[PDB]
Design an enzyme around this catalytic site. Sequence first.
Site, PDB file in Angstrom:
ATOM      1  N   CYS A 109       5.980  -0.685  -0.812  1.00 39.43           N
ATOM      2  CA  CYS A 109       4.880  -1.761  -0.873  1.00 39.43           C
ATOM      3  C   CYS A 109       4.127  -2.290  -2.035  1.00 39.43           C
ATOM      4  O   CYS A 109       3.363  -1.721  -2.660  1.00 39.43           O
ATOM      5  CB  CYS A 109       3.779  -1.037   0.492  1.00 39.43           C
ATOM      6  N   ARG A 112      -0.102  -2.024  -2.687  1.00 41.55           N
ATOM      7  CA  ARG A 112      -0.942  -0.707  -2.343  1.00 41.55           C
ATOM      8  C   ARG A 112      -1.904  -0.467  -2.805  1.00 41.55           C
ATOM      9  O   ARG A 112      -3.016   0.179  -2.566  1.00 41.55           O
ATOM     10  CB  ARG A 112      -0.141   0.499  -2.921  1.00 41.55           C
ATOM     11  N   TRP A 281      -1.760  -8.249   4.913  1.00 37.14           N
ATOM     12  CA  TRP A 281      -1.884 -10.319   5.040  1.00 37.14           C
ATOM     13  C   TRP A 281      -0.863 -10.048   3.950  1.00 37.14           C
ATOM     14  O   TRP A 281       0.007  -9.349   3.598  1.00 37.14           O
ATOM     15  CB  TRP A 281      -2.806 -10.374   4.449  1.00 37.14           C
ATOM     16  N   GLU A 286       6.907 -13.780   1.388  1.00 36.60           N
ATOM     17  CA  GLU A 286       7.562 -13.282   2.453  1.00 36.60           C
ATOM     18  C   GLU A 286       8.339 -14.105   3.152  1.00 36.60           C
ATOM     19  O   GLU A 286       9.115 -14.341   4.320  1.00 36.60           O
ATOM     20  CB  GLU A 286       6.284 -12.175   2.932  1.00 36.60           C
TER      21      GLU A 286
HETATM   22  C1  HEM Z   1      -2.604  -6.362   2.585  1.00 37.72           C
HETATM   23  C2  HEM Z   1      -1.635  -6.499   2.029  1.00 37.72           C
HETATM   24  C3  HEM Z   1      -0.167  -5.840   1.750  1.00 37.72           C
HETATM   25  C4  HEM Z   1       1.140  -7.253   1.507  1.00 37.72           C
HETATM   26  C5  HEM Z   1       0.842  -8.167   0.705  1.00 37.72           C
HETATM   27  C6  HEM Z   1       2.119  -5.770   1.557  1.00 37.72           C
HETATM   28  C7  HEM Z   1       3.149  -6.618   0.863  1.00 37.72           C
HETATM   29  C8  HEM Z   1       4.519  -5.498   0.788  1.00 37.72           C
HETATM   30  C9  HEM Z   1       5.732  -6.158   0.788  1.00 37.72           C
HETATM   31  C10 HEM Z   1       6.113  -7.816   0.345  1.00 37.72           C
HETATM   32  C11 HEM Z   1       6.975  -5.351   1.266  1.00 37.72           C
HETATM   33  C12 HEM Z   1       8.023  -5.798   1.303  1.00 37.72           C
HETATM   34  C13 HEM Z   1       8.750  -5.565   2.575  1.00 37.72           C
HETATM   35  C14 HEM Z   1       9.621  -6.454   2.682  1.00 37.72           C
HETATM   36  O1  HEM Z   1       9.771  -7.813   2.164  1.00 37.72           O
HETATM   37  O2  HEM Z   1      10.085  -7.358   3.491  1.00 37.72           O
HETATM   38  C15 HEM Z   1       5.731  -4.488   1.977  1.00 37.72           C
HETATM   39  C16 HEM Z   1       6.588  -3.089   2.358  1.00 37.72           C
HETATM   40  C17 HEM Z   1       5.812  -1.783   2.549  1.00 37.72           C
HETATM   41  N1  HEM Z   1       4.750  -1.615   3.414  1.00 37.72           N
HETATM   42 FE1  HEM Z   1       3.370  -3.004   2.263  1.00 37.72          FE
HETATM   43  N2  HEM Z   1       1.728  -4.692   2.279  1.00 37.72           N
HETATM   44  C18 HEM Z   1       0.360  -4.516   2.671  1.00 37.72           C
HETATM   45  C19 HEM Z   1      -0.302  -3.891   3.794  1.00 37.72           C
HETATM   46  C20 HEM Z   1       0.009  -3.179   3.706  1.00 37.72           C
HETATM   47  C21 HEM Z   1      -0.578  -1.533   5.332  1.00 37.72           C
HETATM   48  C22 HEM Z   1      -1.728  -2.004   5.442  1.00 37.72           C
HETATM   49  C23 HEM Z   1       0.557  -0.992   4.998  1.00 37.72           C
HETATM   50  C24 HEM Z   1       0.332   0.123   5.940  1.00 37.72           C
HETATM   51  C25 HEM Z   1      -0.397   1.264   6.823  1.00 37.72           C
HETATM   52  C26 HEM Z   1       2.498  -1.529   4.465  1.00 37.72           C
HETATM   53  C27 HEM Z   1       3.284  -0.878   4.981  1.00 37.72           C
HETATM   54  C28 HEM Z   1       4.132  -0.381   3.800  1.00 37.72           C
HETATM   55  C29 HEM Z   1       5.588   0.184   4.788  1.00 37.72           C
HETATM   56  C30 HEM Z   1       5.724   1.333   4.783  1.00 37.72           C
HETATM   57  C31 HEM Z   1       6.381  -1.056   3.562  1.00 37.72           C
HETATM   58  C32 HEM Z   1       8.224  -0.716   4.200  1.00 37.72           C
HETATM   59  C33 HEM Z   1       9.008  -1.266   5.188  1.00 37.72           C
HETATM   60  C34 HEM Z   1       9.842  -1.089   4.973  1.00 37.72           C
HETATM   61  O3  HEM Z   1      10.312  -0.102   4.587  1.00 37.72           O
HETATM   62  O4  HEM Z   1      10.743  -1.686   6.067  1.00 37.72           O
HETATM   63  N3  HEM Z   1       1.477  -2.579   3.597  1.00 37.72           N
HETATM   64  N4  HEM Z   1       5.099  -4.620   1.747  1.00 37.72           N
HETATM   65  C1  LIG Z   2      15.360  -3.260   8.086  1.00 35.29           C
HETATM   66  C2  LIG Z   2      15.041  -4.007   8.285  1.00 35.29           C
HETATM   67  C3  LIG Z   2      13.436  -3.403   7.603  1.00 35.29           C
HETATM   68  C4  LIG Z   2      13.044  -4.911   7.042  1.00 35.29           C
HETATM   69  C5  LIG Z   2      11.320  -5.058   7.011  1.00 35.29           C
HETATM   70  C6  LIG Z   2      10.768  -5.530   6.772  1.00 35.29           C
HETATM   71  N1  LIG Z   2       9.078  -5.735   6.995  1.00 35.29           N
HETATM   72  C7  LIG Z   2       8.774  -4.139   5.407  1.00 35.29           C
HETATM   73  C8  LIG Z   2       6.922  -5.365   6.020  1.00 35.29           C
HETATM   74  C9  LIG Z   2       6.163  -4.202   6.316  1.00 35.29           C
HETATM   75  C10 LIG Z   2       5.281  -3.861   6.537  1.00 35.29           C
HETATM   76  C11 LIG Z   2       4.470  -5.176   5.650  1.00 35.29           C
HETATM   77  C12 LIG Z   2       2.964  -5.672   6.204  1.00 35.29           C
HETATM   78  C13 LIG Z   2       1.592  -3.910   6.498  1.00 35.29           C
HETATM   79  C14 LIG Z   2       2.343  -6.373   5.141  1.00 35.29           C
HETATM   80  C15 LIG Z   2       3.137  -7.519   4.915  1.00 35.29           C
HETATM   81  N2  LIG Z   2       2.956  -8.642   3.844  1.00 35.29           N
HETATM   82  N3  LIG Z   2       4.898  -7.610   5.038  1.00 35.29           N
HETATM   83  C16 LIG Z   2       4.908  -6.271   4.992  1.00 35.29           C
HETATM   84  C17 LIG Z   2       6.529  -6.318   5.307  1.00 35.29           C
HETATM   85  C18 LIG Z   2      13.397  -5.708   7.429  1.00 35.29           C
HETATM   86  C19 LIG Z   2      14.676  -6.131   7.706  1.00 35.29           C
HETATM   87  C20 LIG Z   2      15.767  -5.321   8.351  1.00 35.29           C
HETATM   88  C21 LIG Z   2      16.525  -5.512   8.383  1.00 35.29           C
HETATM   89  N4  LIG Z   2      17.632  -6.242   9.277  1.00 35.29           N
END
Ligand code: HEM
Ligand SMILES: Cc1cc(CCNCc2ccc3c(C)cc(N)nc3c2)ccc1C#N
Lengths: 412, 411
Positions: A109, A112, A281, A286
């Site tokens: 993430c 963070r 947000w 994305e």
């Molecule tokens: C506040 C603005 C936030 C932004 C801009 C953000 C951004 C991102 C982005 C770009 C990813 C990459 C996942 C993807 O591209 O599909 C990600 C992953 C992730 N985020 Fe954040 N996030 C935010 C808030 C949070 C919050 C509030 C949480 C949890 C309470 C969180 C937990 C996670 C977790 C656990 C992943 C890993 C997802 C996975 O491995 O499938 N994020 N985040």
């Molecule tokens: C296994 C898998 C996993 C994911 C993860 C995609 N979502 C991750 C994520 C998780 C949390 C977010 C949050 C909390 C905010 C944000 N802006 N983006 C977020 C993005 C996407 C596709 C696949 C597939 N296939």
Amino acid sequence: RFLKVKNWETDVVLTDTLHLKSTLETGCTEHICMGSIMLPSVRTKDQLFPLAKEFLDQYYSSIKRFGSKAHMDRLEEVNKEIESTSTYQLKDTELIYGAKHAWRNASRCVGRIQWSKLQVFDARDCTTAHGMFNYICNHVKYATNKGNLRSAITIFPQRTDGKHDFRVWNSQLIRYAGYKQPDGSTLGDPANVQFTEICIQQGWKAPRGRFDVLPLLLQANGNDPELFQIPPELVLEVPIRHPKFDWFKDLGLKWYGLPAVSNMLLEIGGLEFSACPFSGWYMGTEIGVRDYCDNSRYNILEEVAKKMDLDMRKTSSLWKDQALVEINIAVLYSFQSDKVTIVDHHSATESFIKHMENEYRCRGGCPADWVWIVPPMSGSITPVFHQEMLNYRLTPSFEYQPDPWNTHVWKG
Amino acid sequence: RFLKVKNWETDVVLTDTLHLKSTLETGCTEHICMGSIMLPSDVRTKDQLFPLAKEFLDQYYSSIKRFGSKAHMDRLEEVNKEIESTSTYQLKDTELIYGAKHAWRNASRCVGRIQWSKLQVFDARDCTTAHGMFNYICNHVKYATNKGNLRSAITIFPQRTDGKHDFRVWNSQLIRYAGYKQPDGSTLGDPANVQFTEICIQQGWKAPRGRFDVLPLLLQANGNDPELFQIPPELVLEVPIRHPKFDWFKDLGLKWYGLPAVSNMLLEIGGLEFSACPFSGWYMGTEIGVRDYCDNSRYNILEEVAKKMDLDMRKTSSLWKDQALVEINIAVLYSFQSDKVTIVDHHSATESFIKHMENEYRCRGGCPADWVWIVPPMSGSITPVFHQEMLNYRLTPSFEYQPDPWNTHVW
Ligand code: HEM
Ligand SMILES: Cc1cc(CCNCc2ccc3c(C)cc(N)nc3c2)ccc1C#N
Ligand code: HEM
Ligand SMILES: Cc1cc(CCNCc2ccc3c(C)cc(N)nc3c2)ccc1C#N
Ligand SMILES: C[C@H](O)[C@H](O)[C@H]1CNc2nc(N)[nH]c(=O)c2N1
Ligand SMILES: C[C@H](O)[C@H](O)[C@H]1CNc2nc(N)[nH]c(=O)c2N1
Ligand SMILES: [Zn+2]
């Protein structure tokens, strides 16, 4: 054991000691790197005490009370409860701490820097799917905040025997339906074809449009899941327009404002929270890069490039690259104009570098997954590209779990 | 331990069996992935060397359908005795060529390995002086360049014998642009080559005052002090950088050289170490346009290009940087293609690599690959490799890094 990481653009060097406190595994060995593997991978109380004690030691350290009478009593309390009931209950303060640190530990993430400002909603008294729907409406309303988005998580009751799980069957609280047509084409979001069919099978009347908001499919206490329509007035959406291209609006694109992931598992002191939707947000890419331009998603590159009248038969004209940028400009422009919170990948990655350095200084490290932290376009012109990162797993954490339709015992 | 890799854009799944033969380490452990570290970390004694030799000869003789043959056994015997005799051994020409091709085949960070088996190997093992090295290198350059129709090549100088008499090419690439100190405390040239560009002057070079000045070769033979040589300019193919639409682009004064030739790596075959082994292929467009031109530590022309596009540079959200980056990369490709000089765009090259992976999984049982390096530095997720799971591991023969000469050279 100390570890050095380097930024190759600035030559800033940081030292990791936090990885020593790393419990879980990576998937790597000294003979193989599984750093680009998408997902690498019923709790006895043999295993549960150490996990509980470790979390409580963490908690009471963070609050200046390690070794205190309160620390020791709580240990004794939790032990008795595990002895007596083969599990235990978190105090509110512990739950809030756990959920925040799960986020803080989320090495994938980039957002963070905001981890300390999480709104935690305790839904551990919930018992039915209807109650779940109520909690989730309130999460959505609160988080959306009329466009001024606020980070939030809602935590439903923990797993017990694994036969009474709370699950949200949606991967995200708000997402668009996908319909596979007889001719092979897809109407709407191809990523959600399977889930849409389940909803439809579960009785959902599908509007069959290209941007239909999916119903919530909610499972309480291990019962069969139930369908709920999120009230449309709670679902904030943005029409996508382009600042200079007027034909762009006519592409008929929109997206929802609130990214709320609902299929992950929150782990805290050995306890497993199988339903814990969390939201923040969007980062612009994305939507603009992945949701719109992935070949396996809405895949609008060609139509956009068509209407830009780009040379499209020579890939080295970079017509794909050119259209990708305009689409992402349009996504950013639209959200800002509608005053819906969004961050561009430049700002986001810059903030994360500042966050990461801060984390090294106050915490001794910050686990980071380069493969996921680097944005899906414009990689090297963001500062995370040039940043070395150590990846390792800390608890509390968010984990993947299998899709509920694959494991669920149906009651009928 | 028979591993699976999935492509998430096509659901194609490959089974990797090749990693099981991995010899060297990765940097990673159970508890920490070092997949994004740029650089995870004296000659070999004599039966550190024979197992090394044996492993190589086994795979060599296996490769030519003569495993377990007496010619195989005889070669093992012969090398074994040569080993116990001389504290080292010498490769047969055929073994040398096989070793070089497979060092490229095994380079997990290289996206262009579909071409791995068409490599021109120049045996330079009879070389004894820096003047001879210069001759060999001019011939490499002329051959590889081929008036713009580039051809992959490697020239291999004598192997290390014990650190005594290392052959080294001090430049990081055979062809690179000077980077000097200057006034303002600014930087003129390639900032990446600052330190090197005055070691050249520190040793007697006198510099042509420009930014795009081709550096002199600094060659070290048999552990001696390194010598300066100027590559004949007619051997150095350069491309003026123009844009197919924007005619002001010429005024920036940009050009780049046609031949990417890395000259500071160490080639290891059957335990033997080749410290001077410059090799060359041809550019992927983004190396120049994205990294060489737009890196903040390099020529960093983004601001300049954006201004003349008259983009909105007041804040990051306009994506002006992104917009210019694309135009810059369109120009590089355009310029090279128009001057009939070989180049591959990142879309074509990553598509090639996916086909290459399926080839290696099918005929070889795997393809080691470093996702961090294979995914292009722009437009990542619209290339097929972004969605491709990859396994990274270390196979031998290999190209390795080695210390910069000016630190280790007992001067
Ligand atoms: C506040 C603005 C936030 C932004 C801009 C953000 C951004 C991102 C982005 C770009 C990813 C990459 C996942 C993807 O591209 O599909 C990600 C992953 C992730 N985020 Fe954040 N996030 C935010 C808030 C949070 C919050 C509030 C949480 C949890 C309470 C969180 C937990 C996670 C977790 C656990 C992943 C890993 C997802 C996975 O491995 O499938 N994020 N985040
Ligand atoms: C296994 C898998 C996993 C994911 C993860 C995609 N979502 C991750 C994520 C998780 C949390 C977010 C949050 C909390 C905010 C944000 N802006 N983006 C977020 C993005 C996407 C596709 C696949 C597939 N296939
Ligand atoms: C023929 C066309 C070729 C193309 C298009 C190509 C492309 C690339 C690219 C883009 C990289 C990433 C490194 C960077 O961004 O700096 C790379 C790395 C590498 N290439 Fe290839 N290359 C080609 C030929 C070759 C040849 C002929 C060899 C050896 C004989 C080779 C060996 C390597 C090695 C060892 C690396 C890793 C370098 C390192 O770890 O620092 N390549 N290549
Ligand atoms: C340690 C290091 C390593 C590199 C790697 C740069 N060279 C990689 C390479 C090596 C060979 C290539 C070849 C042969 C062709 C081509 N098109 N690109 C190539 C790119 C760059 C900076 C640093 C540093 N610091
Ligand atoms: C194969 C590879 O692991 C996969 O495509 C990853 C790459 N990096 C990513 N990074 C982000 N932020 N999101 C993703 O879905 C992915 N997908
Ligand atoms: C820290 C990180 O490993 C470093 O910036 C890497 C990232 N990926 C790269 N990929 C390529 N092809 N070339 C590079 O120089 C780098 N640099
Ligand atoms: Zn790893």
